[PDB]
């Protein structure tokens, strides 16, 4: 039977007209709260966390990798390059590319991270290595954001992503220095003020990575540190029936608000 929490999420879903996916992990007792937790959703930019994490994993055995300068050619620019455009015919280190990809959702930066890993398959390979058997990255930017209904490309489930995000930020899928670096990047995100963060108590600290794409796909995954209690991991994926549907970050904030009550 559904709980009052799942009932509220379903009501929110019905009201929005789309399909909502939610996964909450409370590390206090390791219990999970899920809504369509095992259904696949287009990740869009939330996949950038896996790519950045994969590069962090590589740097565990190559201490200076993050500081390795990477050339940015005019032709490398894609559809959204807020940071990469400032370095055309110049360079960006993998750490700078990671920060740009995670904190500003720079798409060129993501393509450089994917390239560093040997292609989309390299990102998926990292996922499998850390126990994520669901995640799959098939394309590069910007086509990985098409978010076509039913298409399994570039998707994952809320449960899988929440489990993986916990392993990466609170668990030990990454080495000590690397885990901390990921947390630092997620906490400094500049794109999530209207998503999960908007629905959490203002006293709570959080790190997040948003995502958006076709079909009004609006996503956000976050790691949360409530005041006076063990941390949480929350994933909120949302997609709609029609290709040009508008963004609905408010739905994600609403889902977070629902999830936060009674904790």
mmCIF file of C-alpha atoms in Angstrom:
data_model
loop_
_atom_site.group_PDB
_atom_site.id
_atom_site.type_symbol
_atom_site.label_atom_id
_atom_site.label_comp_id
_atom_site.label_asym_id
_atom_site.label_seq_id
_atom_site.Cartn_x
_atom_site.Cartn_y
_atom_site.Cartn_z
ATOM 1 C CA UNK A 1 0.000 0.000 0.000
ATOM 2 C CA UNK A 2 1.103 3.581 -0.669
ATOM 3 C CA UNK A 3 2.106 5.907 2.165
ATOM 4 C CA UNK A 4 0.848 9.466 2.610
ATOM 5 C CA UNK A 5 4.173 10.603 1.164
ATOM 6 C CA UNK A 6 3.696 8.602 -2.035
ATOM 7 C CA UNK A 7 0.087 9.750 -2.180
ATOM 8 C CA UNK A 8 1.171 13.401 -2.109
ATOM 9 C CA UNK A 9 3.806 12.756 -4.786
ATOM 10 C CA UNK A 10 1.239 11.040 -7.005
ATOM 11 C CA UNK A 11 -1.161 13.958 -6.531
ATOM 12 C CA UNK A 12 1.648 16.343 -7.487
ATOM 13 C CA UNK A 13 2.371 14.192 -10.519
ATOM 14 C CA UNK A 14 -1.271 14.154 -11.636
ATOM 15 C CA UNK A 15 -1.508 17.926 -11.231
ATOM 16 C CA UNK A 16 1.645 18.525 -13.304
ATOM 17 C CA UNK A 17 0.535 16.340 -16.190
ATOM 18 C CA UNK A 18 3.893 14.576 -16.369
ATOM 19 C CA UNK A 19 5.729 11.573 -14.921
ATOM 20 C CA UNK A 20 7.610 12.004 -11.642
ATOM 21 C CA UNK A 21 10.407 9.825 -10.268
ATOM 22 C CA UNK A 22 11.641 10.172 -6.692
ATOM 23 C CA UNK A 23 14.123 8.363 -4.453
ATOM 24 C CA UNK A 24 15.069 9.354 -0.919
ATOM 25 C CA UNK A 25 17.727 7.635 1.152
ATOM 26 C CA UNK A 26 17.893 8.532 4.843
ATOM 27 C CA UNK A 27 21.377 7.478 5.966
ATOM 28 C CA UNK A 28 20.219 7.573 9.587
ATOM 29 C CA UNK A 29 18.614 4.131 9.183
ATOM 30 C CA UNK A 30 19.283 3.459 5.487
ATOM 31 C CA UNK A 31 15.565 3.426 4.690
ATOM 32 C CA UNK A 32 14.318 4.466 1.254
ATOM 33 C CA UNK A 33 11.193 6.260 0.052
ATOM 34 C CA UNK A 34 10.462 5.762 -3.626
ATOM 35 C CA UNK A 35 7.962 6.948 -6.275
ATOM 36 C CA UNK A 36 8.378 5.242 -9.662
ATOM 37 C CA UNK A 37 11.763 4.424 -8.165
ATOM 38 C CA UNK A 38 12.564 1.661 -10.641
ATOM 39 C CA UNK A 39 11.327 3.366 -13.810
ATOM 40 C CA UNK A 40 13.864 4.830 -16.237
ATOM 41 C CA UNK A 41 14.065 8.599 -16.784
ATOM 42 C CA UNK A 42 16.285 10.714 -19.085
ATOM 43 C CA UNK A 43 19.167 11.967 -16.924
ATOM 44 C CA UNK A 44 20.094 14.990 -19.018
ATOM 45 C CA UNK A 45 22.715 17.085 -17.184
ATOM 46 C CA UNK A 46 22.521 15.048 -13.970
ATOM 47 C CA UNK A 47 24.727 12.566 -15.843
ATOM 48 C CA UNK A 48 27.538 15.104 -15.437
ATOM 49 C CA UNK A 49 28.017 13.900 -11.878
ATOM 50 C CA UNK A 50 28.950 10.417 -13.102
ATOM 51 C CA UNK A 51 31.415 11.815 -15.670
ATOM 52 C CA UNK A 52 33.065 14.112 -13.118
ATOM 53 C CA UNK A 53 33.213 11.233 -10.621
ATOM 54 C CA UNK A 54 34.801 8.945 -13.230
ATOM 55 C CA UNK A 55 37.615 11.458 -13.781
ATOM 56 C CA UNK A 56 38.019 11.811 -10.013
ATOM 57 C CA UNK A 57 38.402 8.030 -9.803
ATOM 58 C CA UNK A 58 41.161 8.147 -12.436
ATOM 59 C CA UNK A 59 43.009 10.859 -10.488
ATOM 60 C CA UNK A 60 43.250 8.555 -7.465
ATOM 61 C CA UNK A 61 46.132 6.810 -9.239
ATOM 62 C CA UNK A 62 47.244 9.889 -11.222
ATOM 63 C CA UNK A 63 47.595 12.622 -8.577
ATOM 64 C CA UNK A 64 48.131 15.468 -11.054
ATOM 65 C CA UNK A 65 45.387 14.480 -13.515
ATOM 66 C CA UNK A 66 42.951 17.136 -12.298
ATOM 67 C CA UNK A 67 45.529 19.820 -13.017
ATOM 68 C CA UNK A 68 46.208 18.608 -16.548
ATOM 69 C CA UNK A 69 45.438 21.456 -19.015
ATOM 70 C CA UNK A 70 43.108 20.492 -21.894
ATOM 71 C CA UNK A 71 42.890 22.545 -25.102
ATOM 72 C CA UNK A 72 39.569 24.175 -25.987
ATOM 73 C CA UNK A 73 39.257 24.680 -29.740
ATOM 74 C CA UNK A 74 36.613 26.899 -31.391
ATOM 75 C CA UNK A 75 34.971 23.780 -32.845
ATOM 76 C CA UNK A 76 34.594 22.167 -29.419
ATOM 77 C CA UNK A 77 31.829 24.586 -28.438
ATOM 78 C CA UNK A 78 28.299 23.221 -28.460
ATOM 79 C CA UNK A 79 24.925 24.727 -27.426
ATOM 80 C CA UNK A 80 25.690 26.054 -23.904
ATOM 81 C CA UNK A 81 29.259 26.990 -23.010
ATOM 82 C CA UNK A 82 29.173 29.686 -20.262
ATOM 83 C CA UNK A 83 32.692 28.877 -19.065
ATOM 84 C CA UNK A 84 34.327 27.059 -21.983
ATOM 85 C CA UNK A 85 33.790 30.075 -24.273
ATOM 86 C CA UNK A 86 36.150 32.142 -22.116
ATOM 87 C CA UNK A 87 38.945 29.704 -23.014
ATOM 88 C CA UNK A 88 38.661 29.152 -26.774
ATOM 89 C CA UNK A 89 42.153 28.654 -28.242
ATOM 90 C CA UNK A 90 43.231 28.457 -24.622
ATOM 91 C CA UNK A 91 42.898 25.676 -22.045
ATOM 92 C CA UNK A 92 40.954 24.359 -19.069
ATOM 93 C CA UNK A 93 42.294 21.788 -16.613
ATOM 94 C CA UNK A 94 40.165 18.725 -15.909
ATOM 95 C CA UNK A 95 39.375 20.256 -12.496
ATOM 96 C CA UNK A 96 38.200 23.454 -14.205
ATOM 97 C CA UNK A 97 36.205 21.412 -16.714
ATOM 98 C CA UNK A 98 34.644 19.425 -13.868
ATOM 99 C CA UNK A 99 33.696 22.584 -11.935
ATOM 100 C CA UNK A 100 32.246 24.186 -15.080
ATOM 101 C CA UNK A 101 30.254 21.068 -15.954
ATOM 102 C CA UNK A 102 28.891 20.648 -12.416
ATOM 103 C CA UNK A 103 28.437 24.223 -11.201
ATOM 104 C CA UNK A 104 27.293 25.940 -14.416
ATOM 105 C CA UNK A 105 26.219 22.880 -16.417
ATOM 106 C CA UNK A 106 28.596 23.786 -19.238
ATOM 107 C CA UNK A 107 27.992 21.311 -22.074
ATOM 108 C CA UNK A 108 31.377 21.716 -23.771
ATOM 109 C CA UNK A 109 33.037 20.963 -20.433
ATOM 110 C CA UNK A 110 31.012 17.746 -20.219
ATOM 111 C CA UNK A 111 32.109 16.713 -23.712
ATOM 112 C CA UNK A 112 35.732 17.134 -22.619
ATOM 113 C CA UNK A 113 35.138 14.945 -19.560
ATOM 114 C CA UNK A 114 33.500 12.308 -21.758
ATOM 115 C CA UNK A 115 36.457 12.505 -24.158
ATOM 116 C CA UNK A 116 38.888 12.043 -21.249
ATOM 117 C CA UNK A 117 37.040 8.835 -20.359
ATOM 118 C CA UNK A 118 37.161 7.475 -23.907
ATOM 119 C CA UNK A 119 33.573 8.235 -24.866
ATOM 120 C CA UNK A 120 30.083 7.737 -23.341
ATOM 121 C CA UNK A 121 30.938 4.066 -22.835
ATOM 122 C CA UNK A 122 33.745 5.113 -20.504
ATOM 123 C CA UNK A 123 31.290 6.885 -18.220
ATOM 124 C CA UNK A 124 29.012 3.833 -18.172
ATOM 125 C CA UNK A 125 32.052 1.647 -17.446
ATOM 126 C CA UNK A 126 32.817 3.714 -14.346
ATOM 127 C CA UNK A 127 29.209 3.319 -13.167
ATOM 128 C CA UNK A 128 29.444 -0.471 -13.411
ATOM 129 C CA UNK A 129 32.760 -0.392 -11.553
ATOM 130 C CA UNK A 130 31.127 1.257 -8.553
ATOM 131 C CA UNK A 131 28.109 -1.023 -8.517
ATOM 132 C CA UNK A 132 25.671 1.046 -10.559
ATOM 133 C CA UNK A 133 24.126 -1.536 -12.917
ATOM 134 C CA UNK A 134 21.422 0.798 -14.216
ATOM 135 C CA UNK A 135 23.092 3.993 -15.405
ATOM 136 C CA UNK A 136 23.905 4.234 -19.117
ATOM 137 C CA UNK A 137 25.406 7.110 -21.100
ATOM 138 C CA UNK A 138 24.981 6.645 -24.835
ATOM 139 C CA UNK A 139 25.532 10.036 -26.394
ATOM 140 C CA UNK A 140 27.474 13.262 -26.028
ATOM 141 C CA UNK A 141 26.226 16.843 -25.589
ATOM 142 C CA UNK A 142 23.762 18.034 -26.671
ATOM 143 C CA UNK A 143 21.972 14.995 -28.103
ATOM 144 C CA UNK A 144 21.994 13.095 -24.803
ATOM 145 C CA UNK A 145 19.214 15.464 -23.702
ATOM 146 C CA UNK A 146 16.572 14.556 -26.321
ATOM 147 C CA UNK A 147 14.593 12.705 -23.621
ATOM 148 C CA UNK A 148 12.268 10.863 -26.023
ATOM 149 C CA UNK A 149 9.488 8.908 -24.280
ATOM 150 C CA UNK A 150 10.454 5.243 -23.940
ATOM 151 C CA UNK A 151 13.995 5.711 -25.274
ATOM 152 C CA UNK A 152 16.444 3.863 -22.957
ATOM 153 C CA UNK A 153 19.430 5.929 -24.095
ATOM 154 C CA UNK A 154 21.073 8.100 -21.458
ATOM 155 C CA UNK A 155 18.737 7.022 -18.676
ATOM 156 C CA UNK A 156 18.748 5.655 -15.158
ATOM 157 C CA UNK A 157 16.211 5.051 -12.364
ATOM 158 C CA UNK A 158 15.684 7.212 -9.275
ATOM 159 C CA UNK A 159 16.706 4.361 -6.964
ATOM 160 C CA UNK A 160 19.950 3.667 -8.863
ATOM 161 C CA UNK A 161 21.003 7.314 -8.998
ATOM 162 C CA UNK A 162 20.213 7.879 -5.322
ATOM 163 C CA UNK A 163 22.201 4.795 -4.359
ATOM 164 C CA UNK A 164 25.103 5.872 -6.559
ATOM 165 C CA UNK A 165 25.032 9.463 -5.335
ATOM 166 C CA UNK A 166 25.166 8.209 -1.734
ATOM 167 C CA UNK A 167 28.129 5.966 -2.571
ATOM 168 C CA UNK A 168 29.958 8.869 -4.221
ATOM 169 C CA UNK A 169 29.376 11.617 -1.661
ATOM 170 C CA UNK A 170 28.848 9.924 1.709
ATOM 171 C CA UNK A 171 30.104 6.421 0.988
ATOM 172 C CA UNK A 172 33.515 5.414 -0.348
ATOM 173 C CA UNK A 173 33.142 4.735 -4.064
ATOM 174 C CA UNK A 174 35.793 7.466 -4.317
ATOM 175 C CA UNK A 175 38.962 8.055 -2.314
ATOM 176 C CA UNK A 176 38.904 10.491 0.614
ATOM 177 C CA UNK A 177 40.305 13.513 -1.220
ATOM 178 C CA UNK A 178 38.142 12.819 -4.275
ATOM 179 C CA UNK A 179 34.889 12.367 -2.334
ATOM 180 C CA UNK A 180 35.491 15.717 -0.622
ATOM 181 C CA UNK A 181 36.208 17.410 -3.956
ATOM 182 C CA UNK A 182 32.927 16.117 -5.390
ATOM 183 C CA UNK A 183 31.022 17.359 -2.342
ATOM 184 C CA UNK A 184 32.722 20.743 -2.727
ATOM 185 C CA UNK A 185 31.683 21.000 -6.385
ATOM 186 C CA UNK A 186 28.062 19.920 -5.757
ATOM 187 C CA UNK A 187 27.675 22.303 -2.810
ATOM 188 C CA UNK A 188 28.792 25.225 -4.954
ATOM 189 C CA UNK A 189 26.295 24.570 -7.753
ATOM 190 C CA UNK A 190 24.791 27.754 -9.227
ATOM 191 C CA UNK A 191 21.823 26.245 -11.106
ATOM 192 C CA UNK A 192 19.615 24.666 -8.445
ATOM 193 C CA UNK A 193 18.047 27.517 -6.453
ATOM 194 C CA UNK A 194 14.581 26.774 -7.835
ATOM 195 C CA UNK A 195 14.746 22.980 -7.724
ATOM 196 C CA UNK A 196 15.248 20.656 -4.731
ATOM 197 C CA UNK A 197 16.848 23.455 -2.677
ATOM 198 C CA UNK A 198 13.708 25.591 -2.970
ATOM 199 C CA UNK A 199 11.700 22.920 -1.150
ATOM 200 C CA UNK A 200 14.090 22.253 1.735
ATOM 201 C CA UNK A 201 14.300 24.063 5.085
ATOM 202 C CA UNK A 202 16.720 26.978 4.692
ATOM 203 C CA UNK A 203 18.874 25.722 7.580
ATOM 204 C CA UNK A 204 19.815 22.568 5.652
ATOM 205 C CA UNK A 205 23.074 22.431 3.673
ATOM 206 C CA UNK A 206 22.960 20.775 0.249
ATOM 207 C CA UNK A 207 24.918 19.922 -2.859
ATOM 208 C CA UNK A 208 23.092 19.304 -6.124
ATOM 209 C CA UNK A 209 23.257 18.835 -9.871
ATOM 210 C CA UNK A 210 20.294 19.856 -12.011
ATOM 211 C CA UNK A 211 19.316 18.604 -15.438
ATOM 212 C CA UNK A 212 16.952 19.681 -18.220
ATOM 213 C CA UNK A 213 16.141 18.531 -21.733
ATOM 214 C CA UNK A 214 13.439 17.802 -24.263
ATOM 215 C CA UNK A 215 9.934 16.843 -23.247
ATOM 216 C CA UNK A 216 10.160 19.431 -20.487
ATOM 217 C CA UNK A 217 12.515 17.113 -18.641
ATOM 218 C CA UNK A 218 13.474 18.795 -15.358
ATOM 219 C CA UNK A 219 15.773 16.950 -12.939
ATOM 220 C CA UNK A 220 17.880 17.377 -9.821
ATOM 221 C CA UNK A 221 19.878 15.066 -7.582
ATOM 222 C CA UNK A 222 21.186 16.116 -4.275
ATOM 223 C CA UNK A 223 22.984 15.272 -1.140
ATOM 224 C CA UNK A 224 21.557 16.881 1.952
ATOM 225 C CA UNK A 225 22.773 17.669 5.467
ATOM 226 C CA UNK A 226 19.734 18.438 7.660
ATOM 227 C CA UNK A 227 20.283 20.272 10.926
ATOM 228 C CA UNK A 228 20.840 17.901 13.832
ATOM 229 C CA UNK A 229 20.355 14.631 11.936
ATOM 230 C CA UNK A 230 22.147 12.253 9.555
ATOM 231 C CA UNK A 231 22.526 13.253 5.864
ATOM 232 C CA UNK A 232 20.100 12.371 3.075
ATOM 233 C CA UNK A 233 20.262 11.689 -0.636
ATOM 234 C CA UNK A 234 17.346 12.768 -2.825
ATOM 235 C CA UNK A 235 16.729 12.293 -6.530
ATOM 236 C CA UNK A 236 13.834 13.977 -8.314
ATOM 237 C CA UNK A 237 13.310 13.291 -12.076
ATOM 238 C CA UNK A 238 10.446 14.740 -14.086
ATOM 239 C CA UNK A 239 9.479 14.486 -17.738
ATOM 240 C CA UNK A 240 6.396 15.368 -19.777
ATOM 241 C CA UNK A 241 4.247 13.978 -22.676
ATOM 242 C CA UNK A 242 4.953 16.653 -25.314
ATOM 243 C CA UNK A 243 8.333 17.503 -26.865
ATOM 244 C CA UNK A 244 8.320 21.274 -26.271
ATOM 245 C CA UNK A 245 6.871 21.218 -22.752
ATOM 246 C CA UNK A 246 8.204 24.016 -20.514
ATOM 247 C CA UNK A 247 10.521 23.452 -17.552
ATOM 248 C CA UNK A 248 8.908 22.635 -14.190
ATOM 249 C CA UNK A 249 11.529 23.155 -11.502
ATOM 250 C CA UNK A 250 8.682 24.054 -9.122
ATOM 251 C CA UNK A 251 7.550 20.410 -9.318
ATOM 252 C CA UNK A 252 10.966 19.323 -8.039
ATOM 253 C CA UNK A 253 10.846 21.859 -5.209
ATOM 254 C CA UNK A 254 7.347 20.615 -4.368
ATOM 255 C CA UNK A 255 8.531 16.995 -4.336
ATOM 256 C CA UNK A 256 11.396 17.955 -2.016
ATOM 257 C CA UNK A 257 9.008 19.798 0.317
ATOM 258 C CA UNK A 258 6.775 16.723 0.519
ATOM 259 C CA UNK A 259 9.754 14.438 1.146
ATOM 260 C CA UNK A 260 11.153 16.689 3.887
ATOM 261 C CA UNK A 261 8.046 16.707 6.056
ATOM 262 C CA UNK A 262 7.960 14.230 8.913
ATOM 263 C CA UNK A 263 11.738 13.808 9.074
#
